């Protein structure tokens, strides 16, 4: 379900939804935060669904004091009509048995709104990796059959590697929403590109930067080449300070 | 189900230990091994499953082992663990014989090895052996006996049994063609070879696919022996000729 911040929902027809798929840490969510901060996308609404654990703070990307007093919630929707982009931002864990309901909700939402691509920024486990996977590269992708031939050939020309398939199944260890979301989108027959990076939990900011660069190789939403502006909220990412008695 | 199977010492909501169940599955992956009790004695019709053309025959037997003067057993599972388990069997039997100067009753040895296996199942950090042994023997108390233990230590008494590959079909067909108190060792071998024929569908009985043992009592002495290649060939030929005669009669 989508709920606009104002009286009406601005149309997202001809757009491409950029998705944080909650996975191994927050690589996808951090990448989405990076993208929203850099492109300076304005919040358009709230994807108010009961699947995420509720939270409330202030606008993570606050650049002015006026923006610093803009209440935020777990699921907030941003858009940039200049590039025709939509940036949903999940900032919470999922609830038991609510991941697949969330996938269905979001895919119905994008089907109704008109967004063509639901490109997902996600992650998998840097372990449970084959010798080939360990040796080759962390970044992988996955294109649903409905994907247009043009962008599929663009990705092929970029020479990417696709997530290993294990008939087979679309398995993303530590993806959760990712795998089921892709399966349900394939059922819906709507386009999506599931970009992911093999990662281990911890300081994942470099991983988020790598994932947004991986996306940029394809979409070029940023000048291809500090370039990726970080949210002003990124701070104290290891808790409070250390006590005076110690050290 | 992807939970409560990390260790052998962890239960599930239903009250199940999945590690021993997977050990039994590994047993199921083994080769067919039969054991049939009979009035004259008891046999162990095992599947050799040594069919490489560059394999030697420098050992007494692959499936069949000897524990003591009164006991013998077959193996269907992991060979490496089965070796140490059979060594333990021999050692326990010799311990009892040294202490009491009488051959260990079959049930006592079976229970001791089941204690070994269930102790490895009980404590964390140890893998359940995953070997099912098919014990046979004779003793003053219960005469000829046929026992069968599993990785979890659960052992039962049997008139005819099977472990390894196609065990369920073999047991069902044994109880379909077995008589309690009437089978002699002759008919016991006939039934064993029939079951092996009708279970081992990978290839016809070539007398090297098959490894049958025999345990009888002559002069009050437990005679543990293994059917010669000639003997198993005769068994196979008799079974095949009888089946051909039955097919001819059916018309």
């Amino acid at each position: 379900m989508f709920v606009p911040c104002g009286e009406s929902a601005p149309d997202l027809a001809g757009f491409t939804l950029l998705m944080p798929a909650v996975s191994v840490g927050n690589v996808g969510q951090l990448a989405m935060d990076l993208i929203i901060s850099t492109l300076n996308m304005s919040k358009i609404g709230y994807f108010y669904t009961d699947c995420l654990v509720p939270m409330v703070g202030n606008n993570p990307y606050a650049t002015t004091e006026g923006n610093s007093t803009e209440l935020s919630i777990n699921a907030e929707v941003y858009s940039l009509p200049s590039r025709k982009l939509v940036a949903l931002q999940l900032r919470s864990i999922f609830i038991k048995y609510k991941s697949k309901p969330f996938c269905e909700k979001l895919l119905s939402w994008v089907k109704s709104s008109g967004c063509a691509r639901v490109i997902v920024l996600s992650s998998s486990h840097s372990y449970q990796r084959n010798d080939l996977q360990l040796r080759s590269t962390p970044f992988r992708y996955l294109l649903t059959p409905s994907m247009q031939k043009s962008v599929q050939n663009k990705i092929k020309s970029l020479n990417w590697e696709e997530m290993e398939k294990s008939e087979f199944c679309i398995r993303i260890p530590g993806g959760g929403i990712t795998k089921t979301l892709y399966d349900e989108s394939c059922s819906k027959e709507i386009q999506m590109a599931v970009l992911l990076k093999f990662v281990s939990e911890g300081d994942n900011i470099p991983d988020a930067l790598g994932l947004v660069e991986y996306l940029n190789e394809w979409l070029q939403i940023l000048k291809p080449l500090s370039r990726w502006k970080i949210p002003s909220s990124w701070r104290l990412l290891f808790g409070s300070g250390l006590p005076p008695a110690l050290f | 189900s992807r939970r409560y199977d990390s260790r052998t010492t962890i239960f599930s909501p239903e009250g199940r230990l999945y590690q021993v169940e997977y050990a039994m599955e590994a047993i199921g992956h083994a080769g067919t091994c039969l054991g049939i009790l009979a009035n004259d004695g008891v046999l162990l019709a095992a599947e050799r499953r040594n069919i490489h053309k560059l394999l030697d025959e420098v050992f007494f037997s692959e499936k069949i082992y000897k524990l003591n003067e009164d006991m013998a057993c077959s193996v269907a599972g992991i060979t490496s663990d089965a070796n140490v388990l059979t060594n333990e069997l021999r050692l326990i039997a010799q311990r009892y014989l040294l202490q009491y100067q009488e051959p260990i009753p079959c049930e006592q040895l079976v229970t001791a090895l089941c204690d070994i296996k269930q102790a490895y199942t009980q404590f964390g950090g140890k893998r359940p052996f995953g070997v099912s042994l098919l014990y046979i023997g004779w003793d003053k108390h219960y005469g000829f006996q046929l026992y069968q233990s599993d990785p979890s230590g659960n052992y039962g008494g049997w008139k005819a049994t099977c472990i390894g590959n196609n065990s369920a079909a073999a047991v069902s067909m044994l109880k379909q063609d077995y008589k309690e108190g009437e089978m002699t060792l002759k008919s016991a071998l006939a039934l064993a070879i029939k079951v092996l024929n009708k279970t081992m569908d990978v290839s016809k009985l070539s007398a090297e696919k098959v490894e049958i043992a025999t345990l009888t009592r002559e002069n009050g002495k437990t005679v543990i022996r293994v059917l010669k290649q000639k003997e198993v060939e005769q068994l196979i030929k008799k079974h095949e000729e009888e089946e051909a005669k039955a097919e001819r009669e059916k018309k």
Partner: protein, 239 residues
């Protein structure tokens, strides 16, 4: 190595033990602790950040002396510093009892560094978060100065620092030349550097403790006299 920093017995994809590196950074978490080696001996100083005035003077001191002739300036986990100070005390005591003479600074430093490495090897325990530097003087041995790290490497220096502003103090020592004056002249340099690298805005107040060993003190480690200690502080205030 996000997936290879949870244990000290695991290597990274390119062969790193991130636990030891995090111990070296925990060393930096503590205030600076300088020490300069002169021809007469060594002089020790520390940017001892005062915690509270409730604490009695001398509480949680940094300049220990594990032997009559050996000093010890530390920077990092105070508990670990005390533990290695005790270890060094035992090592020196046994060395003097058996070999019959005071343990050479080199031998004691190597013993403690190998103890630290032993701690960094196995997965049972964790590396020491502290770092320290020893100093001794004898008529035969002469001026000596060593520094031990969480990794457990005992390299010798002509003057070095450990802590928050380690690098700045190291560059100031490089700017300084130390082996043509006496301890009475290098104490002032130590105080000057400690004052220079100290940050007033970040840290409200701090106390400068000075200790030295050399022919001046007859090859024994002692705290600088208040008269000289105040003069060194006065020189630091001047510049």
């Amino acid at each position: 190595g996000t997936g290879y920093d949870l244990s000290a017995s695991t290597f990274s994809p390119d062969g790193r033990v991130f636990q030891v590196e995090y111990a070296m950074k925990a060393v930096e978490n503590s205030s600076t602790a300088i020490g300069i080696r002169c021809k007469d001996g060594v002089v020790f100083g520390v940017e001892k950040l005062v915690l509270s005035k409730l604490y009695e003077e001398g509480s949680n001191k940094r300049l220990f002396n594990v032997d009559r002739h050996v000093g010890m300036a530390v920077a990092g986990l105070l508990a670990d510093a005390r533990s290695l100070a005790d270890i060094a005390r035992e090592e020196a005591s046994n060395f003097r009892s058996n070999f019959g003479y005071n343990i050479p600074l080199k031998h004691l430093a190597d013993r403690v560094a190998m103890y630290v490495h032993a701690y960094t090897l196995y997965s049972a325990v964790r590396p020491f978060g502290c770092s320290f530097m020893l100093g001794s003087y004898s008529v035969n041995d002469g001026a000596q100065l060593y520094m031990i790290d969480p990794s457990g490497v005992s390299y010798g220096y002509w003057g070095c620092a450990i802590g928050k502003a380690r690098q700045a103090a190291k560059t100031e020592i490089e700017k300084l030349q130390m082996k043509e004056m006496t301890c009475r002249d290098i104490v002032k340099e130590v105080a000057k550097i400690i004052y220079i690298v100290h940050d007033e805005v970040k840290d409200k107040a701090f106390e400068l403790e000075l200790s030295w060993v050399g022919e001046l003190t007859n090859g024994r480690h002692e705290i600088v006299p208040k008269d000289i200690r105040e003069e060194a502080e006065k020189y630091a205030k001047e510049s």
